[PDB]
Write an enzyme that holds these catalytic residues in place. Sequence first.
Site, PDB file in Angstrom:
ATOM      1  N   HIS A 107      18.465  49.742 -40.901  1.00 19.90           N
ATOM      2  CA  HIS A 107      18.772  50.993 -40.374  1.00 19.90           C
ATOM      3  C   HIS A 107      17.372  50.498 -38.911  1.00 19.90           C
ATOM      4  O   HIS A 107      17.528  51.509 -37.943  1.00 19.90           O
ATOM      5  CB  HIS A 107      18.130  52.091 -40.625  1.00 19.90           C
ATOM      6  N   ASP A 112      20.076  49.542 -47.643  1.00 21.02           N
ATOM      7  CA  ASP A 112      18.717  49.405 -46.237  1.00 21.02           C
ATOM      8  C   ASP A 112      17.990  48.343 -46.339  1.00 21.02           C
ATOM      9  O   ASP A 112      16.768  48.484 -46.564  1.00 21.02           O
ATOM     10  CB  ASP A 112      18.052  50.316 -46.587  1.00 21.02           C
ATOM     11  N   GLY A 133       8.070  54.914 -37.886  1.00 23.49           N
ATOM     12  CA  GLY A 133       7.609  53.641 -37.663  1.00 23.49           C
ATOM     13  C   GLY A 133       6.915  52.854 -38.801  1.00 23.49           C
ATOM     14  O   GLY A 133       6.279  51.910 -38.615  1.00 23.49           O
ATOM     15  N   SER A 177       8.676  52.073 -40.723  1.00 25.43           N
ATOM     16  CA  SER A 177       9.790  51.905 -41.972  1.00 25.43           C
ATOM     17  C   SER A 177      10.170  50.214 -41.849  1.00 25.43           C
ATOM     18  O   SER A 177       9.891  49.467 -40.597  1.00 25.43           O
ATOM     19  CB  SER A 177      11.413  52.119 -41.073  1.00 25.43           C
ATOM     20  N   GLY A 178      10.870  49.047 -42.660  1.00 24.50           N
ATOM     21  CA  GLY A 178      11.063  47.996 -43.007  1.00 24.50           C
ATOM     22  C   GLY A 178      10.201  47.139 -43.347  1.00 24.50           C
ATOM     23  O   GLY A 178      10.049  45.887 -43.583  1.00 24.50           O
TER      24      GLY A 178
END
Length: 223
Positions: free
Chosen positions: A40, A84, A175, A177-178
């Site tokens: 995402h 994801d 902020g 994420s990933g």
Amino acid sequence: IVGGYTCGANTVPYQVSLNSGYHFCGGSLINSQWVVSAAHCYKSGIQVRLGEDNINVVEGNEQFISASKSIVHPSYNSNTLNNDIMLIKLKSAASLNSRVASISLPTSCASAGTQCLISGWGNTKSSGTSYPDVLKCLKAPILSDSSCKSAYPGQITSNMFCAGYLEGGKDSCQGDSGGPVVCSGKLQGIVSWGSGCAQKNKPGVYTKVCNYVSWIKQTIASN
Ligand SMILES: [Ca+2]
């Protein structure tokens, strides 16, 4: 990261910032040419910034490298956030040193109760916005699958796990994420989604990286 602490300059040497004019997602360096992040977080025009601590100040140990190829998981579902995960290939190899290092992929999955380190430059408040400019760290345990599923009924797949505190107060947030979830020296999760941040009984949900290791190894060897 809500309720975490300042990691310290380059103490999380595998952490990357994905930048498209501004920080928008974290990622993990898994070898000199490849980064994994959350699907995402996909965008075209990504610059990967390595060796970062303050993302607003050039402090000297940074390497800024363009992405040449992004590969989102073949079964990523943006509606459920199942699978994801994505891989990002760098235009040229990163120089690996003390400040910039890769994280190992897991040989086995982790169990509930394992303590992990989550890091990111995301929002630091459970209500309101305050973005830090230096990397924040949080130590947090993997929660049981029933705790996870009771918090989000009908929303957790076997490619997800929860980690955090059901009492609230400490969590990842927008902020982040990933970004990495590392448990016993292995990359076990990727910051993916949750309900608000650091709310009681709403823990963070993470992509379970141990389910994707043969897809990762095969994809990077063929690209
Ligand atoms: Ca910097």
